[PDB]
């Protein structure tokens, strides 16, 4: 019974400011990407970057990161700190 055209509000671009290290291209440029959901971004730097348990060396790469490289002692511990950058929520059971 409703009458009227809809028009969802524009979407934002979370983007992934993940400046890898030694990346094929140079100088060390930002990962480069465009997401719409906060879940994607957080899920991006997770596997896309941090990768799964089959990755070699896990470091938090970002344009404005405190560790500016300083890795962690555990794989998860990484994705946990990454959140602070992605802008999403915190990590479950933080050690």
Measure the N-to-C terminal CA separation of the chain; round to a whole number of Å. 54
Residues 65 to 84 in contact with Zn ion, rule: CB under 5 A: 65, 67
| Binding of residue 16 to Zn ion (CB under 5 A) | yes
Of the pair 2, 54, the CB lying nearest Zn ion is at 54
Of the pair 3, 39, the CB lying nearest Zn ion is at 39
# residues near Zn ion by CB under 5 A = 6
Dist CA 7 CA 60 (whole Å)? 38
Q: Which of 41, 50, 60, 78 binds Zn ion (CB under 5 A)?
A: 60
Per CB under 5 A, which region of 1-9, 16-24, 51-59, 71-79 contacts Zn ion? 16-24
Please tell me the number of Cα atoms within 13 Å of 35 on its side-chain side: 17
Dist CA 84 CA 88 (whole Å)? 7
Dist CA 34 CA 13 (whole Å)? 6
Interface residue list for Zn ion (CB under 5 A):
16, 18, 31, 60, 65, 67
């Amino acid at each position: 019974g409703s009458s009227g055209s809809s028009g969802q509000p524009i979407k934002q671009e979370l983007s992934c400011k993940w400046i890898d290290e030694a990346q094929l291209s140079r100088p060390k440029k930002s990962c480069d990407r465009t997401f719409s959901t906060m879940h994607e971004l957080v899920t991006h730097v997770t596997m896309e970057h941090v990768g799964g348990p089959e990755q070699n060396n896990h470091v938090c790469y970002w344009e404005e990161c405190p560790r500016e490289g300083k890795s962690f002692k555990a794989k998860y511990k990484l994705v946990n700190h990454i959140r602070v950058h992605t802008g999403e929520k915190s990590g479950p059971s933080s050690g």
